[PDB]
Amino acid sequence: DPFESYNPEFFLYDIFLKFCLKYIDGEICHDLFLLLGKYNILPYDTSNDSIYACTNIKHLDFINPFGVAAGFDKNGVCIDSILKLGFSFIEIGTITPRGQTGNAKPRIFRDVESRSIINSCGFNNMGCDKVTENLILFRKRQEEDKLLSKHIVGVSIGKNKDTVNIVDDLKYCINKIGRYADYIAINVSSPNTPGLRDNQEAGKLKNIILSVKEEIDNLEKNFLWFNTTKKKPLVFVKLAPDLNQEQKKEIADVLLETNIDGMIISNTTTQINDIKSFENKKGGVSGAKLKDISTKFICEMYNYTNKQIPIIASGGIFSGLDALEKIEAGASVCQLYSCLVFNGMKSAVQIKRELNHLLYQRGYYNLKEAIGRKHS
Ligand SMILES: Cc1cc2nc3c(=O)[nH]c(=O)nc-3n(C[C@H](O)[C@H](O)[C@H](O)COP(=O)(O)O)c2cc1C
Ligand SMILES: Cc1cc([C@@H](C)NC(=O)c2[nH]cc(-c3c[nH]c4cc(C(F)(F)F)ccc34)c2C)no1
Ligand SMILES: O=C(O)c1cc(=O)[nH]c(=O)[nH]1
């Protein structure tokens, strides 16, 4: 009930959201969300998640299948509040070794009609040292907090605008923040850092993955794991949707050869040009117009990797049916971003309820049974 109690479905957040979406600049709305979360004003989801919808990637045990994608809490300033909206994990970042402002504002625009976003942020963030401090404070609160004990935090790492060789920046971040992360996401897919997506070429990607796995493995050589797993972070790579079939196949071969732990499919696209209000805007597109592109990409990569590399789905997930489509395509877990922007505080409670209903209606015993079922 949205009227009798303060909870994630509280009606006033919907009224306010509809006002913001009509009249207020996107990044300003986001700053207000982060302000509310920073002060823990936001409501909590207090309910037991269904045991039949839990999922895992190796030893990462997600209490439910929905997390928040990178770029939402770039600096890790309200991890707690976002998770307590009902999400099982969050990926903070993308961070870089040194703080940087990113591109000039305005650099984010929304199209409500088509539930789409375009952004040219440019990796704005406070820098690895400060974000590490934020994550350490979270980890210290998490040890005492009944609600946060099993929640997972990943960290997405990238390079500073000026950096020649991306591996130097990735190594700096791993050595600073890696011991507080449940997983590291290697961002080689932003469309807003010129040349970054060239690092998806097989030779370059292979060297990047091995360098990152080596730097993580060297942490124990130099109490250690102050994270949820109590184990060294897993390594994921976040992939761009704008690739041809030859590129996707060579990437899949590298992911198999390097024993990467998972792949995040996918980042924003540069190939959607049928949104009027975006016509002269720069950046990558998120939201409902990305859904089909990224689901097909999941199917392709699940098959190219012989179902051996777990998939984190990202792209146009708004509803329980969208989530089930991703899972049946091959994903083990889903990340939301645009859903939070357009459906607001209730996003996680609503989508979890809708997916539990679908799993019943479709005859699945649990969610794991549905993973990859399109291909069976
Ligand atoms: C404003 C904005 C900033 C983003 N920043 C990052 C980022 O820093 N790192 C990253 O890997 N993805 C970033 N993303 C991409 C999202 O993580 C996600 O992959 C994408 O928005 C597709 O999901 P969606 O359709 O549910 O929005 C950003 C997206 C938006 C809209
Ligand atoms: C980085 C980055 C992202 C962006 C853009 C894409 N993000 C948003 O548009 C955004 N993010 C979160 C909300 C929100 C949901 N529900 C709300 C409720 C309120 C309330 F008014 F009730 F307080 C305010 C905001 C929200 C909105 C509208 N810009 O930069
Ligand atoms: O900072 C950004 O511009 C950004 C990064 C990223 O990975 N994806 C995206 O759409 N934007």
Side-chain angles (χ1 to χ4, degrees):
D1 188 298
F3 300 110
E4 183 55 84
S5 149
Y6 191 77
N7 66 100
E9 305 194 311
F10 188 56
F11 77 105
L12 215 45
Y13 280 117
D14 279 336
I15 304 182
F16 287 174
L17 176 48
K18 287 188 188 64
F19 179 88
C20 286
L21 288 171
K22 183 58 178 135
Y23 297 114
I24 307 291
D25 164 87
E27 194 153 7
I28 299 176
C29 301
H30 200 80
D31 290 334
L32 174 53
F33 185 97
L34 297 172
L35 186 77
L36 294 177
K38 168 163 191 187
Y39 284 101
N40 283 285
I41 293 168
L42 294 183
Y44 307 152
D45 182 5
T46 191
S47 64
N48 295 314
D49 288 321
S50 176
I51 62 160
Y52 304 106
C54 70
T55 187
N56 70 288
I57 296 180
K58 279 159 208 78
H59 54 77
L60 281 184
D61 295 318
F62 299 89
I63 59 178
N64 72 61
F66 296 105
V68 174
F72 202 97
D73 190 1
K74 286 169 185 166
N75 299 308
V77 290
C78 65
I79 298 170
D80 312 56
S81 305
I82 289 167
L83 290 174
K84 279 143 64 163
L85 290 173
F87 290 108
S88 61
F89 74 110
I90 182 170
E91 191 172 307
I92 65 170
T94 298
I95 64 175
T96 60
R98 307 185 336 271
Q100 56 177 37
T101 59
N103 295 323
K105 297 172 166 197
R107 60 209 179 175
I108 295 157
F109 303 90
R110 301 164 317 203
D111 187 88
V112 175
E113 157 185 341
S114 64
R115 299 125 85 216
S116 294
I117 307 169
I118 190 166
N119 84 88
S120 53
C121 288
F123 283 159
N124 58 295
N125 71 109
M126 283 171 204
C128 189
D129 297 357
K130 185 61 162 206
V131 176
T132 293
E133 314 312 327
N134 290 338
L135 183 50
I136 293 173
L137 293 171
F138 167 74
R139 291 300 190 188
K140 288 182 176 152
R141 295 191 294 278
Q142 181 184 35
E143 299 198 311
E144 260 278 8
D145 192 323
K146 270 146 142 202
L147 291 174
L148 296 171
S149 37
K150 291 184 178 180
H151 282 73
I152 282 151
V153 182
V155 179
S156 171
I157 57 175
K159 72 179 204 69
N160 280 109
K161 175 179 176 171
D162 50 76
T163 300
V164 174
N165 301 306
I166 179 169
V167 162
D168 304 333
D169 281 0
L170 303 177
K171 289 196 274 197
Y172 181 94
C173 291
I174 288 161
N175 285 298
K176 255 276 161 182
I177 205 168
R179 74 197 305 272
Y180 309 99
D182 295 307
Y183 71 86
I184 296 306
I186 304 168
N187 189 338
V188 285
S189 51
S190 175
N192 300 319
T193 294
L196 183 68
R197 282 174 299 161
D198 290 22
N199 291 114
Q200 295 174 115
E201 185 273 330
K204 292 176 196 55
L205 182 61
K206 174 176 163 180
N207 176 65
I208 284 164
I209 293 166
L210 294 175
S211 295
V212 162
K213 286 170 69 105
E214 262 190 270
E215 208 69 12
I216 288 166
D217 296 352
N218 282 348
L219 282 174
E220 55 192 79
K221 299 162 176 96
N222 316 324
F223 47 73
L224 175 54
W225 303 117
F226 196 13
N227 54 11
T228 299
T229 69
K230 310 302 176 201
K231 289 172 177 64
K232 64 161 152 159
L234 302 183
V235 183
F236 304 157
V237 61
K238 187 158 185 187
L239 298 177
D242 308 308
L243 303 159
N244 64 39
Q245 294 296 335
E246 297 70 27
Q247 297 170 280
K248 291 172 176 165
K249 175 181 132 314
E250 84 174 4
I251 291 164
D253 285 343
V254 164
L255 300 190
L256 294 166
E257 186 189 338
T258 60
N259 283 333
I260 201 150
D261 298 302
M263 55 195 167
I264 302 156
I265 299 174
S266 73
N267 213 312
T268 53
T269 179
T270 66
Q271 290 296 345
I272 290 171
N273 313 111
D274 63 350
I275 300 166
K276 296 190 100 79
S277 69
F278 289 2
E279 68 166 278
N280 269 0
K281 304 276 193 317
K282 296 166 74 170
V285 171
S286 303
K289 288 205 146 292
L290 180 59
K291 185 185 103 212
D292 285 357
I293 294 161
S294 62
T295 298
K296 184 171 172 178
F297 192 8
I298 289 174
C299 291
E300 293 166 338
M301 292 302 288
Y302 191 66
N303 281 309
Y304 278 141
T305 61
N306 191 30
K307 320 190 179 182
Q308 300 305 305
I309 306 293
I311 293 169
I312 298 84
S314 174
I317 302 164
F318 289 83
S319 66
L321 191 55
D322 301 338
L324 184 62
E325 293 170 5
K326 301 294 186 175
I327 286 162
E328 290 180 337
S332 300
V333 75
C334 297
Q335 291 180 329
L336 310 186
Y337 194 125
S338 297
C339 187
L340 272 162
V341 174
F342 294 107
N343 291 341
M345 301 310 160
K346 65 194 193 278
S347 285
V349 174
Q350 189 175 299
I351 199 168
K352 290 185 301 190
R353 178 186 343 110
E354 289 175 344
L355 176 62
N356 290 337
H357 187 214
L358 279 167
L359 290 170
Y360 177 86
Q361 273 179 343
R362 299 309 177 76
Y364 287 112
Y365 190 83
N366 62 22
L367 175 157
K368 299 150 198 158
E369 280 189 358
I371 291 166
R373 274 286 273 275
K374 192 194 177 177
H375 313 281
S376 72

